[PDB]
Amino acid sequence: MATVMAATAAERAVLEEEFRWLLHDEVHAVLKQLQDILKEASLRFTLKQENFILDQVKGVLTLQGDALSQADVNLKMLLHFAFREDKQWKLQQIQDARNHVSQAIYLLTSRDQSYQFKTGAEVLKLMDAVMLQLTRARNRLTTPATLTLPEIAASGLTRMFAPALPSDLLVNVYINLNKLCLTVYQLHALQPGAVLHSPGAMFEWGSQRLEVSHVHKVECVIPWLNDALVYFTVSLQLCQQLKDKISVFSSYWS
Amino acid sequence: MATVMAATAAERAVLEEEFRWLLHDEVHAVLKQLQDILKEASLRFTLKQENFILDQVKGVLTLQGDALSQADVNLKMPRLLHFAFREDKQWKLQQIQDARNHVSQAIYLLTSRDQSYQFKTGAEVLKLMDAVMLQLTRARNRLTTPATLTLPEIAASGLTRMFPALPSDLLVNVYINLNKLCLTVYQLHALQPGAVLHSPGAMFEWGSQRLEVSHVHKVECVIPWLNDALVYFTVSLQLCQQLKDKISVFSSYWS
Amino acid sequence: MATVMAATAAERAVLEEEFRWLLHDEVHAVLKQLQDILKEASLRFTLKQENFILDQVKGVLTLQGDALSQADVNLKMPRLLHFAFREDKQWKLQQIQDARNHVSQAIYLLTSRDQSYQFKTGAEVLKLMDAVMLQLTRARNRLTTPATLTLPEIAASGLTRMFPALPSDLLVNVYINLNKLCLTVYQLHALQPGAVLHSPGAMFEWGSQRLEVSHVHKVECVIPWLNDALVYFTVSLQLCQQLKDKISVFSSYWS
Amino acid sequence: MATVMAATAAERAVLEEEFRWLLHDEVHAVLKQLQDILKEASLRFTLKQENFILDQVKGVLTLQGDALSQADVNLKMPRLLHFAFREDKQWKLQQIQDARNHVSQAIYLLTSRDQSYQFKTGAEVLKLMDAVMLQLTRARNRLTTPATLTLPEIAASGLTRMFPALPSDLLVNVYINLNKLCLTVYQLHALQPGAVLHSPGAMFEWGSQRLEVSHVHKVECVIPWLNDALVYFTVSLQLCQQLKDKISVFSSYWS
Amino acid sequence: MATVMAATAAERAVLEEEFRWLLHDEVHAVLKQLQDILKEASLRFTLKQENFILDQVKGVLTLQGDALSQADVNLKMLLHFAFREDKQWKLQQIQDARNHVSQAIYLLTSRDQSYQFKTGAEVLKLMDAVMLQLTRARNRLTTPATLTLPEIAASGLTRMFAPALPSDLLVNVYINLNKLCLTVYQLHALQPGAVLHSPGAMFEWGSQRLEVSHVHKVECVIPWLNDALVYFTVSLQLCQQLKDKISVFSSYWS
Amino acid sequence: MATVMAATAAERAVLEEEFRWLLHDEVHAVLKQLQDILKEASLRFTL
Amino acid sequence: MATVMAATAAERAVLEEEFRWLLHDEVHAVLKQLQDILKEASLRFTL
Amino acid sequence: AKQENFILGSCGTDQVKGVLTLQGDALSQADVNLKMPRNN
């Protein structure tokens, strides 16, 4: 009988419709929450502690946003170093991370919140984009492995210290996930690659061949970096949850 | 309410299933009919008339199945000459052999399937139909006049050797054109110090000499069983097409 | 230099856009023309001549639209017999009804679209064209002689019942062949102790008896408005094809 | 045992390779033949007969290549009138120009390929074949009567201007139909206070006046070199199809 | 010569066939092993230690399956808390994990062990399904990041303590991979988001605005959770190994 | 105007080409570096 | 009223015509651009 | 130069014809012939 069946397409279609409105509200709830969290994460990168103290080398670094404004270092080999003028060394990891955050936030705020829910693949694409930006920010914050000793030497940071420093020392400052890191490489050229960063690593610099004889590493937690990372993790999980619910929905009615 | 939706969904599922059985029975009905028609078409190619009389050039040809068993030809010149085969020899017409092969293949396609399976989407039926139709259309096409036969190919044909033995101012070709046995005589002319035209004034090389077609004489005669076969092909093609179309309508209807 | 490349890219983008508008106007022009032609074709199927005279068997048939309102037949035997319908009865020719349906569908395809949207790739136009062309070709095909009509189907047809009432040594069939109303009389012969051939010497079963076609008489007459309709179909098909081809040229040109 | 399997696999690989070379030679043979036939077909369109005599309306037309250099027409009315071109003027028949273009393109497709590369799958050959066949079929189609030519388009044609200069109760159209040069005269009738039919009783608007076709006179004459060209097209199409089919058989055989 | 070549298709086909029977036996071996391991993992979740002791806050929790049957907590701010009646707070993470395990086991036991090996894509699909269930169980067992302080407040657990407790305290109990975790949030409303869970985090609750002033975290290893996790890891590796072998096989003969 | 547009396809195509040569050099730089590092990694496993 | 009846509308553009004019212009534009580009490419080879 | 006068409709095909002057956004003139109700 056809009347039964028409009634029937009607009731099934009504249930599925109502459920799409539910999923619609859920999607936008999650999206708004993502903008809130990510904007706070953004606020952590712009301007909160600025002076940081980082056991045989110790140092006091003033870090303003992405700019390492001052770095006063004591080394037991006691010798003492500082910046010249009032110059700032920019930590590119923070800049990059801030860029990814900016992009994620754009992805969230440049979208029509009058979506009238469609299928979900569009939401899924949005989620993928945002998650890629977050994971990239976090990855950048992490210690870069592919930095060679000659790249460290060619870095402006070596040029940056007062008094002007020796060619048996290299200084590198970087961010590892969430803690300001200061590393001093003690070298001495040998008599008549570059990747290991460990004692006994060899490489060329200028026109001379040098070997790392030992390495000194100190570090200190940066509270707002930690807050930012926590925000990234939470945002990633929210995104994943939304993706999973959308998949369950779409597989359920298909 | 979920009970409504479930009982309901059962109602549509029942209707669709019943229609699937209807389509099943229709499919097998049409297939059986195809085997009948095509087997009759097949029976037409093997043993019905054998002697045929074919304008201003005349011929009596004895054709048994695919074999032109004899060909007696009179040509009326400005002067008449008379020709026949080696008495003992038969010239086979390849078109009929080919057509019979395609028919055989179609029938195999129909009889080598289990007529007892439950109905499915139809894409499989569609592929079967395509295969059969391809075989039928190929049979018909082969029966038709082959355009790509060159005059040197006609000369290199055994038929020329098959006749009293005759000069190289004459070429004889016997072929099939759909529903007509065809005899053509090419009257030639060696030229003083391509090949595709088949019309008066066409030029080509043969042996080690250069020749031109001077005149063309064409006679033909209807072959009744070929006509029956062709009619069968047409009808089968339409049956196949109808089944394909109905299957498409069904499949689009419930999707 | 980036300024050059940008201004430049703007120049190509402008040309392509303008051409897209040209193609837009062309598409809608052709579509409008199609509606005109097809509506005239439609008007041909409903009300122009109604009485038709159809060799050695003669007939006067009154045909109104799709309905064969009357059929008066004289058959000249070796002896003449004369037949007519129940006076009150009409036999409908299904081919015309079918064709009219396809025409109706084509016209719907053309009139149920907004003639006001901005131009796109064309694949959508291509699908519209395919749909319309399918409807036209189907109309034409239906108008053509159906091959798959068996002699028992002819016997089981209401037309036999429709005549004074006549014996089972005669079968009468009236159908359409493209541009010709066709009347065929099958003279039969019961056999002493398939069905597709339609030729003298064809055998089949009917009722509970086995019968053979002894002779076949075929007469026909041109139906002017059917001819007009067919001409319209051909022209429409060509218009559609031309639009498809131009769209393809455009799309390949700018890709 | 692995030695058996390896030597063995080498044996199949060798057979397949040798067959690939056979297919290579076949492909290039067929291609060369296509260039020959198509270049002859091309030669037919440029310079063979030029004067043609075309029922109850008669005409002597001088046609040079694609150009109707002169058209002398006698029309026998109920009363005879006689017409000719400006003596100095030529009317070009677009169908021939178009066809010649398609032929040119096909020949380019064949001659702009390196006849020296090693054999591959064939899909590339298949694409070449499709391209060539499309060009041939288009040439043939263009040579055929265009259905989509309206009476107002005929009136707006330069041909009307080309004649002594004549009234608006007469329209003259000259076109090509496959193998026949065609002359048609439309005798008109202004109506008292679409356009596609081309039959007596067809109505249309022209200028600022409304007109009806009163009578139609159609004469035609075979153009020998057009016939040769068409024969060439048919043969080439069959050669292409045969190559496609053989390539498909090969590719399915070894997969 | 064609005879050579026929012999040849025969010997190649025989070798490939025998190897598919080998792969057939390997697949089912691995599958059976997976059912054994996963059923043991399942047995860990149903009913083994029940009382657990979790340095400035300490607590004794009785956990039966997924139900936290009792929680007696001492806080130095010494004040003391317990459950009312004989009521149990269910830890949803354990329930969820148990569900995923149940599903994986169903995936393994609801299949025909008379497979007559086909290609492998079907096996691959099965492996993907099971691995998804395992990884989800493990992920759920892990600390959920997306739990807000207002969600913690709205949790029944706050309502659950005897004596009935103050609005300057929030209590949350959760599972982090394999250890029972007890966290006490000390708040105090400010004078005239919510995600960080760190001291200095702000949020709204009821009709009042509150700030976390400090956080106390204690935890204790749950032996059977650890066993379950070990089982998950081993099962995942077995699945991965089977997937990889199937891929090698399929690429080898194709 | 077509001349403008031809100039235009030319300049865009030139920029894209030069950038592919850049990417070419980058790819091989990275690849060579990978061989160096990986061969050292290899040397750690043999003696 | 007489102006209205007299007024003849502009006839619609022939697609074939426009494509042909475009293609002619493109052919010559491209040829010129090729000459420019190749002449400078040649200039790269000179001192 | 920029067109200002536009012709809408044909004499034979339509029963409305118009010459409309369009200046910017302003329809300054609309001069219309209607062949109604009878076709003479």
F5 interaction partners in chain G (CB closer than 8 Å) = 29
Instruction: State yes or no: chains B and H have 3 or more CB pairs below 8 A.
Output: no
What letter does residue B65 receive in the DSSP assignment? T
Using alpha carbons, select from B178, B227, B230, B243 the residue that is nearest to residue B34.
B243
Q: Read off φ and ψ for residue B162, nearest 5 degrees.
A: -85, -10
Choose the mutation target among D42, D231, D248 for the interface with B, i.e. most B CBs under 10 Å: D231
Per the structure block, which two tokens stand in for B116?
């007892």
- CB neighbours of B205 closer than 8 A, spacing ≥ 6? B152, B195, B211
Name the one residue in this structure whose structure tokens are 């199809």.
Answer: D241
What letter does residue A252 receive in the DSSP assignment? H
Interface partners of F (3+ CB pairs, < 8 Å)?
A: A, C, G
CB atoms G4 and H17 under 8 Å: yes
**How many residues make up chain G in this entry?**
47
Using alpha carbons, select from D183, D178, D213 the residue that is nearest to residue D198.
D213
C101 interaction partners in chain B (CB closer than 8 Å) = none
Interface partners of H (3+ CB pairs, < 8 Å)?
A: D, G
Name the one residue in this structure whose structure tokens are 């919510």.
Answer: E194
Q: Counting beta carbons within 10 angstroms of the beta carbon of residue C165, is it exposed (0 to 12), middle (13 to 18) or buried (19 or more)?
A: exposed
- CB neighbours of E73 closer than 8 A, spacing ≥ 6? E57, E58, E59, E60, E80, E81, E82, E161, E171, E182, E184
CB B35 within 8 A of CB B107: yes
Distance from E235 to chain D by nearest Cα, in Å? 36
Rounded distance, CA D30 to CA D245, Å? 13
N-to-C CA span, chain E:
25
Per the structure block, which two tokens stand in for E132?
């998804």
C-beta atoms surrounding D208 within 10 Å:
11
CB D122 within 8 A of CB D251: yes
Rounded distance, CA A154 to CA A158, Å? 8
CB atoms G37 and F10 under 8 Å: yes
CA dihedral A192, A194, A199, A202 (to 10 degrees): -10
Helix (H) or strand (E) holding A247: helix A223-253
Rounded distance, CA C251 to CA C253, Å? 5
Rounded distance, CA B69 to CA B50, Å? 9
Rounded distance, CA B72 to CA B93, Å? 16
Instruction: State yes or no: chains E and D have 3 or more CB pairs below 8 A.
Output: yes
Per the structure block, which two tokens stand in for D145?
């009567």
Name the one residue in this structure whose structure tokens are 């050695």.
Answer: C56
Rounded distance, CA C237 to CA C198, Å? 32
Rounded distance, CA B177 to CA B162, Å? 22
Which of E146, E196, E197 is opposite residue A237, by nearest beta carbon?
A: E146
Using alpha carbons, select from E84, E85, E92, E98 the residue that is nearest to residue E42.
E98
| Chain G interface residues (partner C, CB cutoff 8 A) | 12-13, 15, 18-19, 22
Rounded distance, CA H21 to CA H28, Å? 6
CB A174 within 8 A of CB A141: no
Cis preceding-peptide flag for E163 (omega within 30 of 0): yes
- CB neighbours of D197 closer than 8 A, spacing ≥ 6? C228, C231, D213
A241 interaction partners in chain E (CB closer than 8 Å) = 146
Q: Which residues of E122-152 are buried (b: 16+ CB within 10 A; e: fewer)?
A: ebbebbebbbebbebbbbbbbebbbbbbbeb
Q: Which residues of A48-79 are buried (b: 16+ CB within 10 A; e: fewer)?
A: eeeebebeebbbbbebebbebbbbebebeeee
CB atoms H33 and G5 under 8 Å: yes
- DSSP three-state, residue B243: helix
> Which residues does chain E break after (C to N > 2.5 Å)?
47, 54, 77, 192
Name the one residue in this structure whose structure tokens are 């070997």.
Answer: A211
Q: Angle at which helices A92-109 and A223-253 pack, to 10 degrees?
A: 40
Taking CA atoms, E70 is separated from D244, E59, E171, in Å, by 82, 10, 14
F9 interaction partners in chain G (CB closer than 8 Å) = 33
Cis preceding-peptide flag for H37 (omega within 30 of 0): yes
Q: Angle at which helices C224-254 and C123-143 pack, to 10 degrees?
A: 160
The residues pairing with D176 across neighbouring beta strands, listed in sequence order, are: D181
The alpha carbon of residue B29 and the mean position of all alpha carbons in its chain are separated, in whole angstroms, by 26
Instruction: State yes or no: chains C and E have 3 or more CB pairs below 8 A.
Output: no
Using alpha carbons, select from B247, B241, B248 the residue that is nearest to residue B130.
B241
What letter does residue A87 receive in the DSSP assignment? -
Rounded distance, CA C32 to CA H13, Å? 12
CB atoms A9 and B7 under 8 Å: no
- DSSP three-state, residue B114: coil
CB D68 within 8 A of CB D94: no
Per the structure block, which two tokens stand in for B238?
């339409």
Distance from F22 to chain G by nearest Cα, in Å? 19
What letter does residue E195 receive in the DSSP assignment? -
CB atoms D197 and C231 under 8 Å: yes
Rounded distance, CA A233 to CA A244, Å? 16
Q: Angle at which helices E2-43 and E92-109 pack, to 10 degrees?
A: 150
Instruction: State yes or no: chains A and H have 3 or more CB pairs below 8 A.
Output: no
F36 interaction partners in chain A (CB closer than 8 Å) = 193
Rounded distance, CA A50 to CA A65, Å? 8
Name the one residue in this structure whose structure tokens are 């420093």.
Answer: A165
CB atoms A234 and E193 under 8 Å: no
Category of E177 on φ-ψ map: left (φ > 0), alpha (ψ -120 to 50) or beta: left
Rounded distance, CA E105 to CA E41, Å? 10
What letter does residue C176 receive in the DSSP assignment? E
Name the one residue in this structure whose structure tokens are 């694609």.
Answer: D66
CB E154 within 8 A of CB E191: no
Q: Counting beta carbons within 10 angstroms of the beta carbon of residue C191, is it exposed (0 to 12), middle (13 to 18) or buried (19 or more)?
A: exposed
Rounded distance, CA D141 to CA D177, Å? 10
Minimum Cα–Cα distance from D8: chain E residue: E8
Rounded distance, CA C117 to CA B147, Å? 49
Helix (H) or strand (E) holding D213: strand D209-222
Q: Counting beta carbons within 10 angstroms of the beta carbon of residue D217, is it exposed (0 to 12), middle (13 to 18) or buried (19 or more)?
A: middle
What letter does residue G44 receive in the DSSP assignment? T
Using alpha carbons, select from C173, C180, C175 the residue that is nearest to residue C229.
C180
Structure determined by: X-ray
> DSSP of E127-163, one letter per residue?
HHHHHHHHHHHHHHHSPPTT--HHHHHTSHHHHTEES
| Chain D interface residues (partner B, CB cutoff 8 A) | 36-37, 40, 227-228, 231-232, 234-235, 238-239, 242
CB D152 within 8 A of CB D186: no
> How many CA atoms, within 13 angstroms, populate the side-chain half-sphere of residue C137?
10
| Chain D interface residues (partner E, CB cutoff 8 A) | 1-2, 4-5, 7-9, 11-12, 15
Per the structure block, which two tokens stand in for D198?
């081309």
CB atoms H12 and D193 under 8 Å: no
Q: Which residues of C196-220 are buried (b: 16+ CB within 10 A; e: fewer)?
A: bbbeeebebebeeeebebeeeeebb
Using alpha carbons, select from C87, C77, C97 the residue that is nearest to residue C142.
C97
CB atoms D37 and B194 under 8 Å: yes
* Residue type, position B21, single letter: W
Q: Which residues of C103-140 are buried (b: 16+ CB within 10 A; e: fewer)?
A: bebbbebbeeeeeeeebeebeebeebbebbbebbebbb
CA angle C145, C148, C152 (to 5 degrees): 110
B1 interaction partners in chain A (CB closer than 8 Å) = 11
Distance from C129 to chain G by nearest Cα, in Å? 19
Taking CA atoms, E156 is separated from E83, E87, E152, E170, E195, in Å, by 12, 12, 8, 11, 19
* Residue type, position A203, single letter: F
What letter does residue G17 receive in the DSSP assignment? H
Cis preceding-peptide flag for A163 (omega within 30 of 0): yes
Alpha helices (runs of H) in E164-203, residue ranges in sequence order: none
Evaluate the CA torsion angle E27, E28, E29, E33 in order and state its sign.
positive
CB C83 within 8 A of CB C207: no
D210 interaction partners in chain H (CB closer than 8 Å) = 12
| Chain B interface residues (partner A, CB cutoff 8 A) | 1-2, 4-5, 7-9, 11-12, 15
> How many CA atoms, within 13 angstroms, populate the side-chain half-sphere of residue A53?
1
Rounded distance, CA C80 to CA B143, Å? 42
Rounded distance, CA C120 to CA C118, Å? 7
Rounded distance, CA D99 to CA D229, Å? 10
* β-strands E161-162, D203-206 pairing: unpaired
Using alpha carbons, select from A128, A103, A118 the residue that is nearest to residue A21.
A118
